[PDB]
Amino acid sequence: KRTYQGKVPLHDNYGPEAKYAVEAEALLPTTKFEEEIARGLELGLPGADSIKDRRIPTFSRGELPHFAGINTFIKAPYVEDVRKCGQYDVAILGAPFDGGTTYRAGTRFGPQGIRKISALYGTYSFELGVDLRESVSICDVGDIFTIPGNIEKTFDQVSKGVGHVFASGAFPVVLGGDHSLGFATVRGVAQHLNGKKLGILHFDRHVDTQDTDLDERMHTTPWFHATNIPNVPAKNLVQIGIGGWQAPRPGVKAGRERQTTIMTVTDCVEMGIENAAKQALEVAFDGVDAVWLSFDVDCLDAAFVPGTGWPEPGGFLPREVLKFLQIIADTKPLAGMEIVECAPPYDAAEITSLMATRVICDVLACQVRSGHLG
Amino acid sequence: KRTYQGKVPLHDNYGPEAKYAVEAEALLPTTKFEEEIARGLELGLPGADSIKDRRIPTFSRGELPHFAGINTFIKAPYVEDVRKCGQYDVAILGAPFDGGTTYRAGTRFGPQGIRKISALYGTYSFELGVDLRESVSICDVGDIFTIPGNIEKTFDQVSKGVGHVFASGAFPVVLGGDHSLGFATVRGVAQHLNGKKLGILHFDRHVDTQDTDLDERMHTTPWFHATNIPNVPAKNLVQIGIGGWQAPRPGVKAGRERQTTIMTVTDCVEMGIENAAKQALEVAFDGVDAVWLSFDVDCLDAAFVPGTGWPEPGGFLPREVLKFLQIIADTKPLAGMEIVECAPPYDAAEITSLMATRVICDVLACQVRSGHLG
Amino acid sequence: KRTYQGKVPLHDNYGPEAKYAVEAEALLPTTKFEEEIARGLELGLPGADSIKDRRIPTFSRGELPHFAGINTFIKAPYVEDVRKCGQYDVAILGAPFDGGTTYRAGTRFGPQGIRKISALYGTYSFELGVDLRESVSICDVGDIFTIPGNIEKTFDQVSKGVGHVFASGAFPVVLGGDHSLGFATVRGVAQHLNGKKLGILHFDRHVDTQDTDLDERMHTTPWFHATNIPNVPAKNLVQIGIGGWQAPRPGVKAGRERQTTIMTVTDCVEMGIENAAKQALEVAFDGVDAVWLSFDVDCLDAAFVPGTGWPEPGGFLPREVLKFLQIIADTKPLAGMEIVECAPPYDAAEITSLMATRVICDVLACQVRSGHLG
Amino acid sequence: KRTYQGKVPLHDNYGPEAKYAVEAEALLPTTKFEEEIARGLELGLPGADSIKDRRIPTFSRGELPHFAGINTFIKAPYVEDVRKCGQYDVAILGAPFDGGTTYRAGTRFGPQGIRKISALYGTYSFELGVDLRESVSICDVGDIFTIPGNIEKTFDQVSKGVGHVFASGAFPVVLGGDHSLGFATVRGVAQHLNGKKLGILHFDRHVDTQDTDLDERMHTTPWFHATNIPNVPAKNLVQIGIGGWQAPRPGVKAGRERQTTIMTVTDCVEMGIENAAKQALEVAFDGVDAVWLSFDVDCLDAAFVPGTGWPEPGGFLPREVLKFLQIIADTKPLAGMEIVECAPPYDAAEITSLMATRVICDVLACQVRSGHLG
Amino acid sequence: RTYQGKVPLHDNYGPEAKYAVEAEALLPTTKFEEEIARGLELGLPGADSIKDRRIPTFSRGELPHFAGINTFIKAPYVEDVRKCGQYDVAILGAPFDGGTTYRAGTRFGPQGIRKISALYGTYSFELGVDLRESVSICDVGDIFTIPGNIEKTFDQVSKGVGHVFASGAFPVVLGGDHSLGFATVRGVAQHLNGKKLGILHFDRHVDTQDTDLDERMHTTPWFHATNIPNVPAKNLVQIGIGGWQAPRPGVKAGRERQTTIMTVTDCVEMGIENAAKQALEVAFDGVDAVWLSFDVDCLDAAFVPGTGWPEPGGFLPREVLKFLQIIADTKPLAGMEIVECAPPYDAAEITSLMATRVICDVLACQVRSGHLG
Ligand SMILES: [Mn+2]
Ligand SMILES: [Mn+2]
Ligand SMILES: [Mn+2]
Ligand code: NI
Ligand code: NI
Ligand code: NI
Ligand code: NI
Ligand code: NI
C-alpha cells in the first residue's frame, strides 16, 4: 500500500500515514500552481501596491480566497460549450431533480450545495498525497435542464447529457438529485459501451430495485429498470450498506430473483472494510471491465448526512466508507460516478454537502494516484 | 443467532446478515398488505383513470405516500375510544410534558416529532427479517392530558393512563416527555402486577436517582421514587451509559445506597456489547419476570440526538445501542417501554425523533420475531 | 409619471399600476430573449426527443431552470478577464469582507448569498415595465480578493477594483461586505471624476461617520474618511433612516460638524416618501452631478432583513424604501451603487439576500426606463 | 413635544426628529463615559503598545467591543448582593419560567436571549436624545430561582424577589418568562403599596383573564387572579391589542364581568396611536397611584416576534407599538415593567429578543428624559 | 483508575462505574455548603413554600442550570484582572475571527461555550472529580480584540494571556480562530524565563505556513510561534492532520522544521493509548512546559458542525476524550486553548458542548493527577 519510501529523509516520530504524506508532498510538482497564479494576475489585475505577496491579484481568479468567487465545483473552469468537455480528464455535471423522492424533496439543490461548500477545499489531499491541480484537468459543465413535472422526460435529459459526457472521454461526476437518476445515468453510459457489460457499485441503505413507486420509476426503482438493459447484468450489481426500515419488500424480492449481491453495514464492518471492498470489487468486476459507482449519501449514519430525504440510523461512519471508496478507487478504474440524495434544505451546516464533496475528491485522487485517471 | 437456513436457495456472495435477510423476506406473508390495499381503495376511492397501478386510491389511506396522511405513529390506526386499546397487541401513547426538565424544555413535543418522522418508515425491517404489518396489531391512542403547571398532577394523569393501557394487555410504548415521567409510568405498571416485582433497564447518561431537584420530583429523581414502591426492587434497576458531567452527586449516592447496577458507556464498549447485554439482562431479570425498558435518547452521543434537553458527548454510537437493544428484546419479554427526552425544537433535521422511532421499531420487531409479542 | 397611455387598448377594471404594466409589457421587444434561446441550444445541445418545447436544451444554458446553473448575479455572464468589463453597461462585483464589523461577522458571504437567491428572479419587472435582458447588458466580474486580516489592505484592493470598473464606463454594482467598504468604493470612484465632486445617498440606521472604532476604520467610520477626500463634500452626504440605539455619539458629532443631512425613518414616513425623496435628491445633487448610492440592508426593519450584523427595530418597510429608491433612480443618474451588510449565516430563508437583489434590480430598472443607463 | 430648540445652530435640511436629535446629542455630557474608560484601563490593563486609541484596555471592560464580554442586560453591572439593588435607579431581573405555557415552552430562556442580544446596543438613542450611561444607574441582579415543576412555588419566588426589588426603590424590569408571571409580579408589587391602588397597561393579543387552564393558573389566567387582589382594580386593567384566535371565551367573559377595557390592534390603528395612548393612559391611571406595564412580545405581528409560544398574525407593527410605548413612558411615571413570552428556541435570528430589548430601552429612555426616572 | 476497596460495593458494576461510585462517596462537600450559604445570603432565602431550604429567592450558584449570568461553568467573574492569580484556573476569551480563511463566526466562540457550559454540574462521574471542591476557577471575560487588524489583535492576546500565565493561574483560552495560537504561545513564552515550550496541537490542519491572503492567518500560527527562540518545532506534535485543507506550503515548512504529525488513521490504528504515549514522549522530550492547542475541527464534522473549516474523517468523541484524559493525567500542562468554535453554524450548541467537555475533562484530569489545585 502507500507507505514512506525513503526518497525524502524524515525523522521516525511520524505516524505511518503522516510519513507517507509528508514525503509525497515534497515530490509533487508546482507547475500548474504557477500557471494559475500567472493567469490570475493577468485576468484579475496585479494586486494593490500595499499587498506584499505579489501572487495576489486585485480580483479573485483562482483557488483563493476560499470564501470568494463564482461557485463551480472546487472552482474548476465553467465550460459553457458542452461539446468541449472531452478536452478535460474529468467533467462535473449536475442533475437538479427531486421528482423521484418518496418522502422529502430538496435534493434538486444538491448540485448547488455541493458546489458551494466545495470552495472550502484546497486542491491537495494530505493523506492521499495527491494534488488534483497538478495531475488532472477538471471542468464543470453545469446542470442538466431537468423537468420537475415529468420524471420520464427528466430521465431522457439526463441520459442524453451524461451519455454525451461519457462518450467524450471525460470521467463524469454526476451531482444529484435523487437516486431515480441512477437509472438514467447508467442507461446513458450503457448506450456508449459498444455492447460491453457494465457493473455497478451501489452504496445505499435502500435496495432501489422495485418496479414502480407511487405509479412511477421513482428513486426506489432505478436498478430494476437499469438491470433490464441487456448489457447491465444484475449479477454485477453490488449493494453495499442495505438495511433499516426503508428497504421495501418488493425491491428485496426483485433483487433476490435477479441475484444481486447485498452486504449490510454490519456485514461490512464485521468482516473488515478491506475484506468487504475486496469482495465487492470481485463481484462487480466479474466478467466486466466497466463499473459505475453510485453513491447515495444516506448510506452514512443520519447524523453525518442530516441533509437527505430518507435518513436512517445505523449506517456507515465516515472513516469506514471513505476507506471503502479509497480501496475501490485505487484498485480498479471506474467508468464514472454519481453522488445522490444530498438535500441542502435539511442540511443547515452543510455537512452533508461536505461529505459528498469529500467522497468525490477522494475517489478522483485515488483514481489519479493509481493510474486510472489523468 | 439469526443466520441463513437454506430454506430459500441463495448464492454465496451475500454478507451473512444480508443472506439471512433475503431469505427471511421470501418467507414472509403478504395477507395484511393485501388487506390494507383493499381497504384503502374502499375508503379512499379508486384512483383516477390515468393511474396505471390500480392499488392506488384517490385519497391516501394507508402507508403511501410516506409524506402524506394524518400522522399517527407509523400511521397506525387512531383509537379514539381508549377503552378499546386492549384489542391491539401494542398501544402507542404520548406523555407531552417538560415540567420536569432542569435545562432546556421542548420535549413536550417529543410525541408529535416522533409521530411525524415515523411516516418515513415502511413496515418491514431488512436485517431483522420482520414485517410488523403482518405480525402484530399496533394502535395509537394519542396523548395523556398533561398538566404543565403541576408535575404531581401530571404524574397522576400518566400513571392512570399507562396503568389503563398496561392492564388492558396491550404492550405500552410511551412517547415522552421528560424522564421524570418514568416514575409515573412505572408506578402505574407496578399497580397491575398483582404484587409481582418489576425490574428496570435504564439507558441514560444520567442516574436520575436523587430525591428532589429545584424542590420537585424532576427528571433527575424518577428512580429514587420508583424504587420506593414496594414491588420495584432497586437491585433490579440496571443503569446503562451513565457518564459525563450531568450525573448529580446526590443521585449517585442514593443509587449506591440502594445497590443499583451501573455500567458506563466505556464499560459496555470495552467488554463487548453482547457481553454487556448479557450482564444487564442477568441483573434486571434476577428474581423478577416483568422488566420495563426506559430509554433516554441522551444516551446517544450528542451529535446523533441534538434534539434533547441534556446532551452529552461520549455516549453510545447508534450501532452499539441498537445491537444492545436487539439482544435485550430478542432474549426476554418486556412489560413495556418508554422513550423520553426527545425535544424537537432543538432537532432541526429530525434525526433525534428518527433515532427514537428506530429504537421503538427495532425493539418491537425483536419482541415479535422472538415470540414475546404478537 | 408612469400611467396607462392608451397605446395598447385595455379594459377599465385594471388598477392604475397594473394598467400601466400590462400595456408596457405589450410594447417590449423579444430580440434578446430569442438570442439567448438560440445560444442555449447551441451550447447546451438540443433537448431530448421527448421534450415538446424545442427551446429547451439538454444542458441548462440561460435563465431556465431557475434552480439550476452556476450562480452568477441574475445569471449574467461571468467575465473572467476583468479588462473587458467596459464592454457591458453594468458590472456586478463582490467585496466579500467582514473585518469591519463591530458585532456579527458573516457579511463576507453577502455576495454569494445575493448571487444565489438572485436566480429566483426573471429578467422582467411587472410594475416597472422593464425587461433588463432586452434593455441593458450586465456582467458579473466575480469578487475582489479581500484581505480578512487587514482592513487597510482590503480597502486598497477594493478601491483599485471598483476604480477599474467605474473607469471602464460600466455602472458598478458592489455586493458587500460590511459598510467599511463604503470608504474604499467612494475613494476609488472619486479618483476617476476629473476633480468633479461626488455626492452620497446613504440608506442606513447607522450614521457611519466616526473616526475610528476598535482602533480601526471599521463600518462605523466610512463617511468620516470618505468626506475627507477633497472632491467628496460632506454637505452632499444625505443620510436616510438614521435612528435607534446604534448610531454612536462620536459619529453624530462629526456628522454635525461636517453638516451632513439626516432624515430619520419617522421623518420620511411622516413627510411622505415622495417628499422625502425630493428633499434627499435636492441635497445630494446640489452643485454636483455624480452621486453614489450606498444602501445598508439594515435600514429595513429587522424582521425583513434578519441576516445582518446590526439589526434594529423601527426601520423602513419594503414598500416605503422601494418607492424611495424608485423615485431616486427614475429622477437622476447614479454613478454606481453598493448594497452592504447582508449576512447569510443569520438569514435562514434568504429573505435578506432577496431584499438586496430586489433593491439592485429596481434601481437598475428605473435607471434604464428613465434613460440614465443602457 | 421634542423639537429643535435653537440652542445648537443647525442647517435646515435636517428632518424634524433628526434636527432635535443632532442638537440633543451636542448637549449631552460625557462624564460617565470618561469614568467607564478610566475604570476599564485600571481593571482591564492598558492596551498593547500597537493600539493607538489609548482608551482601549487589554481586557474588555465596559461597552466595547459589543461582541465581547459577560452578558448582563446592556452590560450593566451584575449586583451579586441583591440587598444592594436599592443603590440603582433601575434593576433588571429575570424570571426564567415556562411552566405556564399552553402551547410552546422555551420562554425560560427569554432572559438569557434578551441579555445576549442586548450587547449589540450602545448606551444612546439617536431619536430619543438620551444617553442612559449619563442619566440613570442600571444594574442586573440576575434571575429568580424558578421552580419548573410547580407554578405556585414559582409565583411565590417571583413575588418575593420582585417585591424586594420594588420595595428597594429601584425601578424593576422583569424579563420573562411566560405571562403567568404577571400575576406574581403584580402581587409582589401590590404587597408593598401600603393600600394604594395599581393600574395595569397590558400589551397582548390574549386577554389572560380566565380562572384556570389545564387545572392551573397558567399564562391565560394572570389578570383574573391579579384583579382579585383588593388594591388591583380590574377597571384599571387596560388590554391593548386583543384579537385573533387565541383569546379564550372564559377569559373574555370574566373580563366583561370585571369591566376591563379592551382596544384591539385595529381599534388603535384606526383611531391613531397618539389618541389610543391618551385613552389607555386615561383609563389605567383613573383614580390610582401607580401603573404597571406588562408587555407580551406576542402583541407584535408574528413576523417581528417569531420566537414566542403563542404567535398571531395581524398584530402591531414595530413603529406603531414603539410610538405607543414612548407616549406612555413620556407622559406618566411607571411603577415597573415586565417583558414576557420571548422564546429564544423559536427565534433563530434573535429578532424577538431584539424587539424586547428595544422596548425596554425606549421605555427607560422616555422615563428618564421626562423626569420620571433618574 | 480502579475501584480501591475503600467503599464496599457489589460485584455487578462495570469497572469504570465501580471506580466512579466509590470515588463519589469519598469526595468532600465543604465547598458545596459554602456556595449554598453564600447564595442564601446574597440572593435571599427562598419563599416559605419552598421545602428545600438550600434554595434562595434569586439564583446565585450552580442552580438552576437554565438561569443566571453566563460565566464559564458559572465561575465568578473577576472584574479586576490583576486579581486573577488568586485562582488556580482563569478562563479568558479571545473573540476574534479575522484570521479565518473560509467562514467567520468564531468571534462568538467564547460566548457560545460560556452559554452551554451552564448545563454542566461541577462533578464528573467517570473521572471521579468535583471541581467545586478541588480547584478555584474564575472567568476574567474577554480580550479586547481588534477585528480590522490581526497584528494588533495578536498584541492584545499576547499581553492578556501573558498576564494571566505570569500570575500563576492556569489559563484556559476560549477562541476565536487558530491564528490566536501564535499570540497565546508568544505571550506564554515571554514568561518562561528562557525555558522551552512544547505544543500538543489537535487539528486536521497543519497551520504551519508563513502567510495566507497576505497575513498571519489561522493557517500560519505555528510557523511564527516556532520562530520564537524557546519554542522548538521538534516539540510541536500535530495530532489529527488530514483531509483536503492541510495546505502544501504548511506541510513543507513543517517538514523543514521537523514537527511530528500523526493522522487520525495513524492514531486509531495504533490505539489511542499508544498514540498518547508517543505524543507525550515527543512533546515533552527535553522540555517541561507544554501548551495544549485544541481545534474543535479535529473531530468529525458531524460532532462539530459549528466551525469554519469542518472536515469528514476526524476523531470520534470517545477517541479524542481518551487521548486528552491520558495527556492531562500523565503530565502537567502550562495552559490550553480551545479554538474555532463558531456558534453561528452550531444550531443545537453541540460544538460549544464538545468544547466545554474538552476543557472540563482536561481540568479534572489535571486535578486528580496532582498537576492543578
Ligand atoms: Mn437510500
Ligand atoms: Mn399573549
Ligand atoms: Mn483546524
Ligand atoms: Ni438510494
Ligand atoms: Ni434520564
Ligand atoms: Ni452602514
Ligand atoms: Ni400574554
Ligand atoms: Ni487549527
Author numbering:
A (entry chain A), B (entry chain E), C (entry chain C), D (entry chain B): 4 to 377
E (entry chain D): 5 to 377
From the paper:
The guanidinase enzyme of N. inopinata was expressed in E. coli, purified to homogeneity and characterized as a homohexamer with a molecular mass of 240 kDa, resembling the recently discovered guanidinase of Synechocystis sp. PCC6803 (GdmH). Crystal structure analyses of the heterologously expressed N. inopinata guanidinase (resolution of 1.58 Å) revealed that it exhibits the same α-β-α fold of the arginase subfamily as its cyanobacterial homologue, but with each subunit containing one nickel and one manganese ion with the overall structure being highly similar to the Synechocystis enzyme with an root mean squared deviation of 0.74 Å over an aligned length of 361 Cα atoms. However, the N. inopinata guanidinase possesses an N-terminal extension, which is lacking in the cyanobacterial enzyme. This extension stabilizes the tertiary and quaternary structure of the guanidinase through extensive interactions, consistent with its notably high thermostability and activity in a wide pH range. On the other hand, in comparison to the cyanobacterial enzyme, the N. inopinata guanidinase lacks a C-terminal extension. In the active site of the heterologously expressed N. inopinata guanidinase, one nickel and one manganese ion are coordinated through conserved histidine and aspartic acid residues. The positions and identity of metal sites were determined by the diffraction anomalous dispersion signal and corroborated by inductively coupled plasma mass spectrometry (ICP-MS) metal analysis. Another notable difference between the active sites of the Synechocystis and the N. inopinata enzymes is a tilt of N. inopinata guanidinase Trp313 towards the active-site nickel ion. The tilted Trp313 in N. inopinata guanidinase permits access to the active site from the surface, in contrast to Trp305 of the cyanobacterial enzyme, which blocks it. The hexamer’s ridges display a negative electrostatic potential, and each cavity marks the start of a 17 Å negatively charged tunnel towards the active site.
